[PDB]
Design a protein around this ligand. Sequence first.
Ligand SMILES: NC(=O)C1=CN([C@@H]2O[C@H](COP(=O)(O)OP(=O)(O)OC[C@H]3O[C@@H](n4cnc5c(N)ncnc54)[C@H](O)[C@@H]3O)[C@@H](O)[C@H]2O)C=CC1
Ligand SMILES: NC(=O)C1=CN([C@@H]2O[C@H](COP(=O)(O)OP(=O)(O)OC[C@H]3O[C@@H](n4cnc5c(N)ncnc54)[C@H](O)[C@@H]3O)[C@@H](O)[C@H]2O)C=CC1
Lengths: 372, 375
Amino acid sequence: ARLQMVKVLAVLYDGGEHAKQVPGLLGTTENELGLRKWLEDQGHTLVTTSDKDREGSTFDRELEDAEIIITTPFHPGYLTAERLARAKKLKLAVTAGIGSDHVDLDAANKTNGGITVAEVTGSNVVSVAEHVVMTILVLVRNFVPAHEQIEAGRWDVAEVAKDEYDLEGKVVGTVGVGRIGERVLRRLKGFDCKELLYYDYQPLSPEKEKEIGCRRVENLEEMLAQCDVVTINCPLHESTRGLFNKDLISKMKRGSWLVNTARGAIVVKEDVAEALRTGHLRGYGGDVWFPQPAPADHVLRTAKNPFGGGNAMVPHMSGTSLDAQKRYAEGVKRILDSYLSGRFDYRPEDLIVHQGKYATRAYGQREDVKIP
Amino acid sequence: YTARLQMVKVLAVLYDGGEHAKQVPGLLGTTENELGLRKWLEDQGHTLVTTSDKDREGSTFDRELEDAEIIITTPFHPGYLTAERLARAKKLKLAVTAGIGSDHVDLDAANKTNGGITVAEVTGSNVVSVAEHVVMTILVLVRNFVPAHEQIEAGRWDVAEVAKDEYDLEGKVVGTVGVGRIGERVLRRLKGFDCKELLYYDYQPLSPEKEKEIGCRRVENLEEMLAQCDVVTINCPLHESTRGLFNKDLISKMKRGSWLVNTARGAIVVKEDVAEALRTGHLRGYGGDVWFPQPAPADHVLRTAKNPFGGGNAMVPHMSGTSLDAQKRYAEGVKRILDSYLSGRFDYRPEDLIVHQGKYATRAYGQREDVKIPG
Ligand SMILES: NC(=O)C1=CN([C@@H]2O[C@H](COP(=O)(O)OP(=O)(O)OC[C@H]3O[C@@H](n4cnc5c(N)ncnc54)[C@H](O)[C@@H]3O)[C@@H](O)[C@H]2O)C=CC1
Ligand SMILES: NC(=O)C1=CN([C@@H]2O[C@H](COP(=O)(O)OP(=O)(O)OC[C@H]3O[C@@H](n4cnc5c(N)ncnc54)[C@H](O)[C@@H]3O)[C@@H](O)[C@H]2O)C=CC1
């Protein structure tokens, strides 16, 4: 028996005129992931908002009787313990994308009998892996200040060649070798890095290690000390919040490059900025911030190395490329259909928490994980 | 025993590193560091004059080239060896490029100068560096990085504004014009990105084994290739048949909203035609590091041209082949070529020669009859 007259609340980013001009912007308040007719034809209701941060936000009002809440990491409705305690009807929290750390998952497990938190696993992992390799190259090859010199009408090859290196012969390490981290290594293979390294408590198979040509390092600090480039590709959970602080960054090589497309809160922003300021890091880049939207005065918008380069920051966009949005929009529909049909026939890999327990190994090494 | 040549006048035209080249000694290809050649030459009894002053009427270059026996140039700051200048270079026997691409020499005039001068370059020295730069530039354009970074530095936040022109490289068709040392290395780096297809156009094909190893397909007609690609990268030398190749007519054969990358030479494109294609949205993006002439004039149109959304420009100064890792290799290669000449052996690597003994010594500067490949 299908569930009936279900209230769905979606918190998405505002596409303004862009989302009218470019209909491929599915993940916007304008286009609503292409869900509205599909839901309404079944007798369900959909409320969509981008208003999610202020006291008495539309989000705060609507979450009190939503049965399904759709969020998206690029404009995250933070499902705090306080909000979940007020979400009296909530059964399913769907992430339109990947990374459900904007939900208090421990509170979700104690809410309304244990809510299901699902995301579209695999939907945008290629998009992010491409973004990582791009960002690595932009930082290593000193692109940003070089492009700024050209647009300013200047010409000084030595000024920007003095901090320009090749990625060939450099050691690159990934923190996390899941769907993104493995795909990063697969794209780096053709660049003839000296070594490709990873750190993860969930290792690659020996066959994948040989196919890609990479090596597992058992200790994070020992990996950092060997790398020229470090890329962060793990989820945000209690043990990764503030992991990259001044003490851990100090284990990276002087003049190294750090890339973070995972989550902003995995780094300590003031520690990254200080490392750049003194030249301990040559560069930092990526697309993720805490909180989002990034405050207008966030220090990593403008932090530079001592040469006035080393910043390859963008807004949170890598996982919301036009190609990615088509995939996560289709995946949200599939998850919604699992719930609304009354089958509850979720793909196991889509579940983060379910029936009062963690349903993943990827949010830290836990006891009391129930894989369905 | 062969007798070494004696008291040879070497002229080097290199870029000025200012304070940078004192701070960072790895800037070898500068007037400050002289490719690490000075002691090595002087200990043999040779002389070295080095300058960056190469463009103005009565430049140091113009004065010194009249009795230089060896002229070292570098593409990043090219001493243009015009027919007029070569006619005045009465002692010139060897022109060495510190890097790759010798189109800043009039090679037809070089073949008629002093019985045919040797023009050599450091083949392979910075091909990896450039191929990396191409893949970086493709990703920067496809993923709309530049306006996104600008939004952040300005204190703004609007994901839709920059995601609306953000694509993945996965599933796109990429084609290279030229599948030589750089073009092949571009395709090798693109392999892991799961492009829909990798294409090339070159009258010198890859072996069938390499086509299958990389996973790429030869297209027999350039316009046929362009019409199939989402991304086009130019990786061929500048010669008569590639000067102005990418004009309005050829660019019109590319797909609407395509991305064009040029790390080869600026004069292979018609800059006004690229700018117009970008401005009308026929190109989504143009990027690379090469310009004509160099240094690029301060008002060069491709410094500031944008697509209709205010993005699509990934231009940098001529730097990809002069990364710190590249400079170590081409500096060592220039020394090797100089030693072949100065030793009196003339035992050049064949692949380093562009013209030699009055004939083209390469197949890469157009399909020619009267090519004499040494060996
Ligand atoms: N910038 C963007 O738009 C996007 C960012 N993401 C972020 O990237 C994360 C990873 O995504 P996937 O690779 O698809 O997830 P995944 O679940 O396939 O892989 C994550 C890996 O991280 C590992 N990990 C967990 N804690 C770790 C630690 N302390 N040290 C090293 N490894 C650890 C897990 O064991 C797992 O193998 C997401 O959770 C999300 O936060 C994902 C997609 C979009
Ligand atoms: N941006 C930078 O710093 C650098 C740029 N370059 C430029 O890249 C060029 C290529 O370098 P490599 O690949 O090392 O040379 P290469 O000689 O190995 O390969 C060039 C290829 O282009 C092909 N070609 C010639 N005319 C063509 C046409 N009309 N259509 C298609 N293919 C054509 C040749 O047949 C040859 O296979 C250099 O000649 C130089 O102009 C090279 C190094 C540094």
